[PDB]
Design a protein around this ligand. Structure first.
Ligand SMILES: CCCCCCCCCCCCCCCCCC(=O)OC[C@H](COP(=O)([O-])OCC(O)COP(=O)([O-])OC[C@@H](COC(=O)CCCCCCCCCCCCCCCCC)OC(=O)CCCCCCCCCCCCCCCCC)OC(=O)CCCCCCCCCCCCCCCCC
Ligand SMILES: CCCCCCCCCCCCCCCCCC(=O)OC[C@H](COP(=O)([O-])OCC[N+](C)(C)C)OC(=O)CCCCCCCCCCCCCCCCC
Ligand SMILES: CCCCCCCCCCCCCCCCCC(=O)OC[C@H](COP(=O)([O-])OCC[N+](C)(C)C)OC(=O)CCCCCCCCCCCCCCCCC
Ligand SMILES: CCCCCCCCCCCCCCCCCC(=O)OC[C@H](COP(=O)([O-])OCC[N+](C)(C)C)OC(=O)CCCCCCCCCCCCCCCCC
Ligand SMILES: CCCCCCCCCCCCCCCCCC(=O)OC[C@H](COP(=O)([O-])OCC[N+](C)(C)C)OC(=O)CCCCCCCCCCCCCCCCC
Ligand SMILES: CCCCCCCCCCCCCCCCCC(=O)OC[C@H](COP(=O)([O-])OCC[N+](C)(C)C)OC(=O)CCCCCCCCCCCCCCCCC
Ligand code: SF4
Ligand code: SF4
Lengths: 315, 186, 67, 102, 105, 70, 165
């Protein structure tokens, strides 16, 4: 078996990991900048030139501060949550649709659901090992919302797989050669935005990891490098949700630069809803995840069952 | 126009007093705003329109925000144009100081003047209320324009008579301009 | 009435139920259109499929033009 | 518009499947010739290797035949471990681990 | 899949090496009694909840149910159409009737 | 004013454009063919196996010059 | 080779599962055993569908209940021992060098993959994960999956009654 396939797969995956990490740092810069411009105030400035090395000022500070612990005797379980969190956030990117072959993921949606189903696991070990009642409450709340929209996300992506006829992510490209799926799936676009802001903890679904009702949900005892790895993992999840919105709804367009312009625009939309919306409640979010989104998921899955049967007779 | 649940009187205004509309046009309008996020779209548009607004960030310290000639800052001891210190040790400022920061000890000088031997203001105790400059019969004690006087050390904010006299020597132009532009109000 | 109350309180579920009823109707329409013609005999077989002339399945092949 | 796009994707994959059906029988005949040749060398290698083990003849498990109730000249395909016997592990993982590596 | 193991082990190795070098680069001060304390706001300091457990159980039942909705995209071009439609309509309709019945009761 | 966001965003557009475009150079360097062979269908894997059987580089072409004159 | 590596990892995680007693630590050992079991069942099969199904159902779907119950059961932290880590590492390096000195052709599994099949096999070229999942949605075995969905609803009805809410 030809060895340059292994060599180029390794080089492409490591280049993807490096570029994703630097894009995470510049996404933190972009979020602090335009999130300021959501209000009247300016973003970061005055560090380096025009605030550009501000995430490197964050990275030098967070990798130097004292690694404190929630208890003094045994704290190796405190270490294993940001390692697995950053590992999953850098490991989920392997199911990106690459047209030049990197990994031939014939089942990419199942891989995405697997990594999202570990997201609950890394936040559960984040909550328990931090030895605080605020940490356990935030971990239970995050596990609650992420398994509540895991079922909804599985049904929404399962409705999307009926359109392309297979689980191969590159099959989203061939069915978008004439128009985007934003035209046909606009309530699904709004529902998928509500899904992608729920698995990754953002401001519309922030009762898990907010600064109001809790001081911090599961980052309350995490600092000095562990918080840096957790922050980078969460912003890599934001970047992955922006890419996965841009593949399914917007045309995959992997080569074109307009695809990455749209990916930066969907990241801008993620920071745009970061500054606008208030936060839902536990009871209203159980109402949203299990009744409204579930009923819409099953109903419009029935709609595509009927539509894919109707086109199968006509074709 | 929805009807009133409670009849609104003349001198009052009622909020959430409208009846919920039951005609099918208003029900379809509220249904489409619920389903298609119309009010969230208006909130997103109002939020996005503030990116194009001018930022109000005033770029400290190259550009500093507006002040007033009445502004209360660092306390300072003024002097006469001839050069004699203005403070006649009359102790109304310490009597009127509500946090009792001012400590005055006075002796007769060699020529027979009343001027102080000790005038200490605890700026960690001073509340910057400006009662001393109103209670000063001469214009001796004054609120200077300075507020960038943050100190590294707790003892450096214990202002002596020499520190107040040096503040009066340093800040005399702006203090005299504020007192010229503000004395007819007081 | 009853549909006005459901359209007032839960309009997304009413719209989803309308979509599901439409999908069920066009699913039955697609099943009837599939079985109205010879849908069990697909035009484009997978693999390499050959029949000799003595087989009964060779008389049921489709000679339609490519769409 | 999605119906038109799905029709275009369907005619593209039908074109690819028809090209695959064209390419297939030549490769089937080439595999047939190599499979018969490799079965001949595997039988010769098993015959020359087992010249010292008592009670062993080629093709049967110690005299007892493997398959009964069959014609005397029939052929069944040997399993992948027995066909890729008399060979190193690199030839086994050369074929068996193509999907698992990429 | 064998390349996926290698790249996942490399991501795990790189993250553990980065965290080990961060622990070396972290400023080591004197450890304290109060610094190791769990954080409760201000002054220093949960039972089993059944509602969250039945939330996890509802998630599990719907997850195993979704794992049977998953295969039928592939089977639609390789099965009997009437049987596939009857099973899919019956499957999602009984799911919807059960969801609405558990909502009403 | 508001164009200071574009320093923080366009760089995001560049970096994520790196891991494909460099490979679109790099597969043109050591392989010579810009696209690696798709391993989704089994027939593509069998024909890739046939190419790597025929030549030690599976992306090296066996054209009509391989056919002997007869 | 990597099948023998997964054998060694499953043996090591099973003997440390037998050794330890803290309930969240056994839950962590189960969640890291499920990954190796998923991969090792992926080595025998034509395609990785059922490993994914076992993954979503068992690890991400079911064991989170076990992790939650064992997290709220134990107040204390793990007492990590370097002796058990050293013994696990020593038996792991011993079993990997034992797999190095062992012939991997005789130790490989006889179950055929998608590429271990014959080239003239018509059924392998059609569609990945198509013919194996076909009997789920065809006559007369569709009654079992209808009964399975009904069984899951009836299971939820049982669970609400026995926990008493
Ligand atoms: C040439 C030969 C030279 C001589 C070699 C001698 C070898 C034998 C002696 C050393 C030895 O094994 O001592 C046993 C001694 C006793 O350990 P233990 O009590 O069995 O268990 C460890 C505690 O639970 C740990 O309790 P803790 O929570 O206080 O641990 C602090 C933690 C602090 O961890 C870190 O600082 C690591 C930072 C993150 C790393 C990446 C994630 C993991 O340290 C480690 O995890 C050590 C690794 O362990 C060590 O000294 C560990 C380091 C070796
Ligand atoms: C090994 C790498 C070592 C260099 C790392 C980068 C350091 C850059 C730096 O600190 O620049 C900011 C500092 C200055 O920025 P600053 O943040 O100190 O101040 C900004 C200026 N005001 C406050 C007026 C708006 O740069 C220097 O001190 C000189 C940098 C020389 C070039 C270094 C590499 C740049 C890439
Ligand atoms: C994108 C990720 C980037 C991660 C790295 C970001 C920063 C990189 C550039 C800065 C490196 C700083 C290194 C030192 C950090 C710790 C500082 C400190 O307190 O050191 C005290 C220690 C010990 O000094 P000490 O004697 O004062 O310590 C005794 C303990 N206390 C503090 C309580 C009194 O200094 C050293 O160990 C010296 C290290 C020299 C080499 C530094 C690293 C070089 C390679 C990089
Ligand atoms: C380029 C675009 C620029 C503009 C947009 C920029 C942002 C990008 C998009 C962001 C979207 C918002 C994300 C966060 C959302 C937060 C709010 C939220 O979750 O609200 C939940 C709310 C909650 O519902 P609710 O409002 O009923 O509940 C609250 C009220 N109580 C509790 C009293 C009942 O809405 C929904 O869940 C609506 C359902 C999903 C959407 C509708 C789908 C219906 C089916 C399709 C149509 C059916 C046919 C209709 C016609 C025929 C009728 C017979
Ligand atoms: C720690 C594990 C974190 C969670 C990983 C979930 C991966 C998805 C589950 C799974 O079985 O994936 C099969 C997949 C294989 O997917 P596949 O077989 O569908 O893809 C074909 C393979 N390629 C893309 C190369 C053509 O295997 C993995 O993801 C391996 C995970 C290794 C984990 C190592 C640390 C333990
Ligand atoms: C390889 C790492 C093995 C770690 C291990 O077994 O630690 C022992 C401890 C055992 O915890 P324990 O508290 O149950 O210890 C009882 C077992 N003895 C006394 C024999 C050590 O396990 C852990 O800390 C689990 C960590 C996560 C493993 C995944
Ligand atoms: S009121 Fe004025 S003049 Fe009198 S003692 Fe105080 S500072 Fe001196
Ligand atoms: S401003 Fe008020 S607090 Fe300060 S010295 Fe004058 S009287 Fe005292």
């Amino acid at each position: 078996m030809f060895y340059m396939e292994f060599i180029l797969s390794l080089i492409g995956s490591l280049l993807l990991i490096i570029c994703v990490l630097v894009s995470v740092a510049f996404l933190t810069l972009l979020e602090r900048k335009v999130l300021g411009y959501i209000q009247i105030r300016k973003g970061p400035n005055k560090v380096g030139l025009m605030g550009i090395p501000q995430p490197f000022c964050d990275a030098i500070k967070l990798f130097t501060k004292e690694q404190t612990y929630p208890l003094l005797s045994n704290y190796l379980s405190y270490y294993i949550s940001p390692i697995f969190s950053l590992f999953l956030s850098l490991f989920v990117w392997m199911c990106m649709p690459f047209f030049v072959k990197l990994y031939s993921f014939n089942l990419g949606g199942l891989f995405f659901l697997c990594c999202t189903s570990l997201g609950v696991y890394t936040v559960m070990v984040a909550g328990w090992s931090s030895n605080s009642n605020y940490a356990l409450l935030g971990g239970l709340r995050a596990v609650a919302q992420t398994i509540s929209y895991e079922v909804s996300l599985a049904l929404i992506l399962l409705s999307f797989i009926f359109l392309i006829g297979s689980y191969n992510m590159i099959y989203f490209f061939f069915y978008q050669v004439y128009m985007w799926f934003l035209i046909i799936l606009f309530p699904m676009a709004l529902v998928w935005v509500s899904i992608s802001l729920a698995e990754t903890n953002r401001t519309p679904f922030d009762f898990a990891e907010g600064e109001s009702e809790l001081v911090s949900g599961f980052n309350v005892e995490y600092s000095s490098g562990g918080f840096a790895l957790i922050f980078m993992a969460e912003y890599a999840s934001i970047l992955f949700m922006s890419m996965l919105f841009c593949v399914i709804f917007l045309g995959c367009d992997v080569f074109n630069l307009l695809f990455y312009m749209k990916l930066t625009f969907i990241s801008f939309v993620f920071i745009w809803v970061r500054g606008t919306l208030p936060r839902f409640r536990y009871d209203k979010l159980m109402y949203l995840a299990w009744k409204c989104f579930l009923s819409f998921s099953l109903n419009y899955l029935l709609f595509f069952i009927g539509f894919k049967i109707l086109l199968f007779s006509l074709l | 126009e929805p009807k009133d649940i409670v009849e609104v009187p003349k001198g009052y205004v009622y909020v959430n007093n409208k009846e919920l509309s039951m005609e099918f046009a208003d029900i379809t309008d509220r249904a489409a705003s619920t389903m298609f996020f119309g009010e969230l779209l208006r909130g997103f548009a109002v939020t996005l329109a503030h990116i194009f607004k001018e930022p109000a960030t005033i770029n400290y310290p190259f550009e500093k925000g507006p002040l007033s000639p009445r502004f209360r800052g660092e306390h300072a001891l003024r002097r006469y144009p001839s050069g004699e210190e203005r403070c006649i040790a009359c102790k109304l400022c310490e009597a009127i100081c509500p946090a009792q920061a001012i400590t005055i000890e006075a002796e007769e000088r060699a020529d027979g003047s009343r001027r102080t031997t000790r005038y200490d203001i605890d700026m960690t105790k001073c509340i910057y209320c400006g009662f001393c400059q109103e209670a000063c019969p001469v214009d001796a004690i004054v609120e200077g324009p300075n507020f960038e006087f943050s100190t590294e050390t707790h003892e450096e904010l214990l202002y002596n008579k020499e520190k107040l006299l040096c503040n009066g020597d340093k800040w005399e132009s702006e203090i005299a301009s504020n007192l010229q532009a503000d004395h007819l109000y007081r | 009435s009853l549909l006005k109350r459901a359209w007032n309180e839960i309009p997304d579920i009413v719209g989803g139920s309308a979509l599901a009823l439409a999908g069920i109707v066009m699913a039955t329409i697609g099943v009837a259109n599939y079985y109205a013609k010879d849908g069990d005999n697909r035009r484009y077989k997978l693999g390499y499929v050959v029949y000799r002339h003595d087989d009964p399945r060779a008389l049921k092949v489709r000679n339609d033009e490519d769409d | 518009i999605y119906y038109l796009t799905a029709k275009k994707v369907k005619r593209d994959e039908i074109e690819m499947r028809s090209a695959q059906n064209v390419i297939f029988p030549i490769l089937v005949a080439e595999r047939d010739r190599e499979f018969l040749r490799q079965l001949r060398r595997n039988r010769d290698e098993e015959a020359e290797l087992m010249k010292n083990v008592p009670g062993w003849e080629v093709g049967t498990w110690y005299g007892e035949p493997v398959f009964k109730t069959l014609p005397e000249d029939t052929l069944v395909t040997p399993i992948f471990k027995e066909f890729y016997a008399h060979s190193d592990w690199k030839s086994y993982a050369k074929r068996a681990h193509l999907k698992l590596w990429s | 899949m064998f390349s996926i193991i290698f790249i996942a082990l490399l991501i795990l190795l790189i993250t553990t090496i980065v965290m080990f070098l961060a622990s070396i680069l972290s400023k080591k001060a004197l450890i304290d009694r109060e610094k190791s304390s769990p954080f409760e706001c201000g002054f220093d300091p949960l039972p089993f909840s059944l509602r969250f457990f039945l939330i996890t159980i509802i998630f599990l039942i719907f997850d195993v149910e979704i794992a049977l909705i998953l295969p039928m995209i592939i089977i639609m071009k390789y099965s009997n159409i009437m049987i596939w439609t009857i099973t899919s309509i019956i499957f999602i309709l009984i799911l919807l009737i059960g969801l609405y019945h558990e909502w009403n009761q | 004013m508001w164009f200071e966001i574009l320093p923080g965003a366009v760089i995001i557009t560049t970096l994520l454009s790196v891991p494909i475009y460099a490979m679109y150079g790099l597969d043109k360097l050591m392989i010579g063919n810009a696209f690696r062979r798709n391993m989704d269908e089994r027939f593509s894997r069998v024909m890739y196996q046939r190419d790597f059987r025929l030549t030690d580089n599976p992306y090296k072409m066996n054209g009509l010059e391989q056919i002997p004159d007869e | 080779m990597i099948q023998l590596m997964l054998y060694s990892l499953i043996i090591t995680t099973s003997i440390i599962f037998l050794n330890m007693i803290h309930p969240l630590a056994l839950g962590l050992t189960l969640l890291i055993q499920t990954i190796f079991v998923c991969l090792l069942t992926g080595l025998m099969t034509k395609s990785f569908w059922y490993s994914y199904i076992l993954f979503l159902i068992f690890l991400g779907g079911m064991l989170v209940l076990f992790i939650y119950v064992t997290s709220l059961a134990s107040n204390e932290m793990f007492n990590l021992s370097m002796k058990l880590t050293l013994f696990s590492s020593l038996i792991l390096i011993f079993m990997l060098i034992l797999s190095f000195i062992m012939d991997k052709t005789s130790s490989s599994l006889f179950l055929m993959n998608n590429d271990m099949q014959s080239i003239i096999n018509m059924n392998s070229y059609f569609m990945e994960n198509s013919l194996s999942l076909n009997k789920l949605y065809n006559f007369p075995t569709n009654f079992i999956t209808i009964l399975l969905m009904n069984y899951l609803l009836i299971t939820l009805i049982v669970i609400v009654k026995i926990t008493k809410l």
